[PDB]
Design a protein around this ligand. Structure first.
Ligand SMILES: [Zn+2]
Lengths: 72, 113, 794, 93
């Protein structure tokens, strides 16, 4: 299970990278921290914590038109 | 609490003089240690006022060494007819270790004034 | 009983309190330096010919002073007497007092050493070299005794560390001054013991911890004005403490006084010599082989070691600006330039170029190159910088805005993973589970890493046992061959890598290895055998799988270094790389059962075999300099014909300027690299291996001597150890018989396989338990006292 | 700069160690700063001496190279800044 969590996180930070988020600094800091952490996790819970506490970072952006991708 | 060195330094007589050529064949008293390299020599003992050179056959007797001497150390031994002046030359540039063990064996052998 | 106790309170401070027993002696576990005719070593015996009184204080508190009364032979009683009576003057003498007292019907003599100190310099130096946190207490009790720190500190675990809790340094530092005090008194002592004309040797376990002396036994008489001491056990043991505790720091103040501020050497004074030599003549006076500051004047390298130490000490008193290149202004056809005409290392004194030339019109490719890589031109024209993120002494800037680094994530490979789960993998509770990943790194990655050189200290490494185990290590390398070569014989692989800086603004090494004849390269080479070429360096961030989220760096070196060090070492480097069946095993495939062969070698009949490895905690930052020079020297040893002398010496100098301590273009700016190696030059994995062997040997030497004397059974090995000590301190020059003997002894009971900084040792078990082969605890001790980090036993 | 030619004439021999050339003769100073505390302890006010010479602040850019006046740097406007501010001071004279 959780193994997919680590994976999804790798994909995800790669996305936030290529969306040119590193023009900020403090962003790149908080993100790279969340990454470097779950990639040492131990229990699905606090993982999912840091997971959403990241993801929302992306959500606050407006490069993604998720109303599309949620086409299923 | 830390004793230095029980000795075995021998003493012979041989040749020394004031210059390279002035060394007569019998006038000096060598103190030495036969180490890995022949009768390796340490110090000279004499009665003459000055001797700045010495000459000793090699390990096998090829040539004669031209080993200069120190500004000799002054002291007086005793012979049954009173005090007697003696000098202790060292082979120049001889560090404190062998100077020390030579003084050890020597002052052991000869009681001074 | 008391009349005695009374009668040894002599005349002073009658406040005594025998922490002994009654009128019997005492039993103390004290760590001597001993060498009779039969035993030898630096080891912790049980001594008992002494009655011991703890002098108390008004208000009837205890107080660190002692009356130690010894009882021995009448004859010896006289010797000690007449000697003491000759020498009751030079204040470094603990004020003795003799007497005759009766025990029963026995008129036993007694000597009364007055006001000493519970310990001696021995217990210090010993229980600091042979540390072991499981039971280091005497360290605890000293450090609180001299107010270095209050007891509470010690329960905060990781108080002994270094990579951790590095504030520990200051604690040790608090002691330093008092050590210095000792030195001075001893010199006074030596002078007296000369002019009064005495002979004997000074040993540590005659030294109350303040400074006085006492145990005057074995000295013997002589003419006055001609007395000799023997100071080569003393210093040569005291050496490395002398820059743990920094016993020289009270020498930069306005008058060697802790109160006053500092001297201020005028910014321009780079020379500094009669200083160096004066310090030496005030402290290490009675040393017994000449010292000649500028190492240029040294002879066969071994004199270069015996003066590179004293410089690595006297150079923590001078200021850290006047170290480094020495520029000067020249004229390229009537055009002002600034170029580095010399250098001024922290050890190798002053060094001056030898083919320098002002006023030149048109300058060719060679010197053009050698000018674009000197930092003189670069930093002489740049914005002054000041950085508050490191401590490494910054120097200059270049741009007008620093650059920030980042290390992107890795990218996924979904399918293979989807496959993987489809084959029933990663199903929870598996015993295989992802563990290595592409960690990501934020902004200030580099400098927040390059900071680590602050883990690197100066050090003085004991000089005698070093001047020996360099010889044994040398013996490990008598089956190869090397020397200078020529252009058409170097061999480059993947001639397409980086080219440092600034040459990387123009392309890879294709150009520079291409845009030059062979004669070009030979002019270069046979040039640097008489000059110096300070260089730069870049730091790079690695980007590859890992398991620990730290950073990584690799020092990309500038082309004018490799392009010579190759030519100078290639023959050897091959000769090692391609030989099968030896100690160093760089370059032997693990395919086609070559691995199995490696093992069935490094076994090879050692009787009772156990296997042990280890690992070096932060290996390439914390390696002190002395050991790096030792590596470079052992490699160059085989160059005895191609080279000469001054050729070598300048070649060593060029290397020590190009890899040891030169500027580091980290980020967008220039710093200094105070020490430590640099994992990117031409001669690493080899040099790391050599250093490693040096550690393993030194550990075994200590493990031998450290052992007691009279429990060794094999009379042969006892006579070994004894002979070893003799060859090591008493002697001056090599005992090839003995060295071959030793090397064989090791190959028989301590065989070892080495990759660059990665070992395996197969060793003779019951020996270990008998301590005649360095089991682990000795590794703790060595990594401590001369790599000053702490190698955990996990 | 003349100042150099000065400093080299003043030499004992025409040799000066490198580490005191950019220090004394050079002009425009850059400074890095990691924290607010170090800021207010080392480059507080509009000017300061250092290496025994005066220096004037020009602009104080930050990590994203956003000009930042010498006002915003309060104690408490600090936790809203990219923190390794670059102060570009000048060889005051
Ligand atoms: Zn020398």
């Amino acid at each position: 299970k959780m193994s997919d969590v680590k994976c999804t996180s790798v994909v995800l930070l790669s996305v936030l990278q290529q969306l040119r988020v590193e023009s900020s600094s403090k962003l790149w800091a908080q993100c790279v921290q969340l990454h470097n952490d779950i990639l040492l996790a131990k229990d699905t819970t606090e993982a999912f914590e840091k997971m959403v506490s990241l993801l929302s970072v992306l959500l606050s952006m407006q490069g993604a038109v998720d109303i599309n991708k949620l086409c299923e | 609490n830390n004793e230095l060195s029980p000795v075995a330094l021998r003493q012979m007589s041989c040749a020394a003089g004031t210059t390279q050529t002035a060394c007569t064949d019998d006038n000096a008293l060598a103190y030495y240690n036969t180490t890995k390299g022949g009768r390796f020599v340490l110090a000279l003992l004499s009665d003459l006022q000055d001797l700045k050179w010495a000459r000793f056959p090699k390990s096998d007797g090829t040539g004669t060494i031209y080993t200069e001497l120190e500004p000799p150390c002054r002291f007086v031994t005793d012979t049954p007819k009173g005090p007697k002046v003696k000098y202790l030359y060292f082979i120049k540039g001889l560090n404190n270790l062998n100077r020390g063990m030579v003084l050890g064996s020597l002052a052991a052998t000869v009681r001074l004034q | 009983a008391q009349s005695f106790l009374n009668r040894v309170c002599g005349v002073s401070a009658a406040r005594l309190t025998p922490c002994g027993t009654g009128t019997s002696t005492d039993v103390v576990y004290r760590a001597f330096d001993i060498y009779n005719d039969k035993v030898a070593g630096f080891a912790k015996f049980l001594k008992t010919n002494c009655c011991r009184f703890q002098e108390k204080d008004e208000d009837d508190n205890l107080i660190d002073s002692y009356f130690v009364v010894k009882r021995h032979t009448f004859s010896n009683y006289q010797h000690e007497e007449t000697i003491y009576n000759l020498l009751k003057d030079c204040p470094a003498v603990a004020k003795h007092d003799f007497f005759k007292f009766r025990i029963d019907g026995d008129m036993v003599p007694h000597i009364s050493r007055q006001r000493l100190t519970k310990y001696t310099m021995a217990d210090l130096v010993y229980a600091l070299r042979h540390f072991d946190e499981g039971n280091c207490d005497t360290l605890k009790e000293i450090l609180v005794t001299y107010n270095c720190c209050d007891d509470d500190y010690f329960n905060k675990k990781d108080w002994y560390d270094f990579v951790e809790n590095p504030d520990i340094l200051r604690v040790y530092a608090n002691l330093g001054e008092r050590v210095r005090q000792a030195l001075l008194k001893t010199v006074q002592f030596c002078d007296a013991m000369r002019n009064a004309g005495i002979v004997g040797v000074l040993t540590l376990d005659n030294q109350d911890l303040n400074g006085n002396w006492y145990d005057f036994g074995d000295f013997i008489q002589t003419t006055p004005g001609s007395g000799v001491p023997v100071v080569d056990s003393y210093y040569s043991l005291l050496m490395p403490i002398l820059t743990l505790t920094r016993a020289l720091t009270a020498e930069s103040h306005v008058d060697t006084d802790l109160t006053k501020p500092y001297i201020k050497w005028d910014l321009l004074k780079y020379d500094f010599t009669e200083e160096r030599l004066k310090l030496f003549d005030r402290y290490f006076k009675y040393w017994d082989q000449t010292y000649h500051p500028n190492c240029v004047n040294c002879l066969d390298d071994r004199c270069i070691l015996h003066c590179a130490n004293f410089n690595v000490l006297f150079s923590t008193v001078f200021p850290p600006t006047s170290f480094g290149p020495l520029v000067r202004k020249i004229f390229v056809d009537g055009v002002p330039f600034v170029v580095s005409t010399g250098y001024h290392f922290r050890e190798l004194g002053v060094v001056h170029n030898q083919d320098v030339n002002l006023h030149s019109s048109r300058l060719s490719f060679k010197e053009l190159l050698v000018y674009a890589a000197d930092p003189a031109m670069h930093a002489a024209s740049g914005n002054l910088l000041l950085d508050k993120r490191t401590t490494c002494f910054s120097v200059a800037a270049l741009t007008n805005n620093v650059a920030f680094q980042t290390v992107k994530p890795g990218n996924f490979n979904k399918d293979f993973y989807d496959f993987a789960v489809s084959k029933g993998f990663f199903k929870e509770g598996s015993s295989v589970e992802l563990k290595h990943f592409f960690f990501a790194q934020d902004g200030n990655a580099a400098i927040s890493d390059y900071d680590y050189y602050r883990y690197n200290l100066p050090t003085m490494c004991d000089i005698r046992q070093l001047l020996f185990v360099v010889e044994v290590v040398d013996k490990y390398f008598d089956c190869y061959d090397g020397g200078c070569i020529n252009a058409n014989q170097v061999i480059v692989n993947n001639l397409d890598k980086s080219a440092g800086f600034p040459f990387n603004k123009w392309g890879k090494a294709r150009l520079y290895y291409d845009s030059m004849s062979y004669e070009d390269q030979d002019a270069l080479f046979a040039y640097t055998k008489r000059n110096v070429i300070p260089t730069i360096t870049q730091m790079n961030l690695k980007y590859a799988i890992s398991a620990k989220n730290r950073a990584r760096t690799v020092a990309g070196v500038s082309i004018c270094s490799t392009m010579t060090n190759r030519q100078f070492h290639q023959k050897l480097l091959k000769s090692i790389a391609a030989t099968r069946g030896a100690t160093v095993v760089i370059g032997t495939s693990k395919f086609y059962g070559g691995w199995h062969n490696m093992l069935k070698t490094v076994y090879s009949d050692v009787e009772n075999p156990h296997l042990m490895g280890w690992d070096y905690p932060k290996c390439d930052r914390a390696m002190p300099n002395m050991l790096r020079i030792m590596a470079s020297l052992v490699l160059a040893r085989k160059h005895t014909t191609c080279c000469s002398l001054s050729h070598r010496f300048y070649r060593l100098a060029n290397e020590c300027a190009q890899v040891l301590s030169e500027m580091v273009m980290c980020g967008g700016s220039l710093y200094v690299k105070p020490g430590g190696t640099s994992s990117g030059d031409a001669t690493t994995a080899y040099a790391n291996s050599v250093f490693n062997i040096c550690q393993a040997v030194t550990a075994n030497v200590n493990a031998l001597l450290s052992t007691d004397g009279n429990k060794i059974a094999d009379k042969y090995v006892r006579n070994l150890q004894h002979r070893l000590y003799e060859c090591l301190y008493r002697n001056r020059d090599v005992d090839t018989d003995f060295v071959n003997e030793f090397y064989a002894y090791l190959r028989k009971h301590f065989s070892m396989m080495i990759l660059s900084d990665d070992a395996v040792v197969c060793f003779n078990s019951t020996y270990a338990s008998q301590g005649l082969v360095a089991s682990i605890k000795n590794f703790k001790s060595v990594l401590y006292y001369q790599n000053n980090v702490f190698m955990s036993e996990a | 700069n003349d100042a150099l030619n000065n400093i080299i004439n003043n030499a004992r021999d025409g040799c000066v160690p490198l580490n005191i050339i950019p220090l004394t003769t050079a002009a425009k100073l850059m400074v890095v700063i990691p924290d607010y505390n170090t800021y207010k302890n080392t480059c507080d006010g509009t000017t300061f001496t250092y290496a025994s010479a005066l220096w004037e602040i020009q602009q104080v850019v930050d990590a994203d190279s956003k000009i930042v006046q010498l006002s915003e740097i309060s104690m408490d406007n600090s936790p809203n800044l990219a923190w390794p501010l670059i102060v570009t001071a000048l060889r005051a004279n």
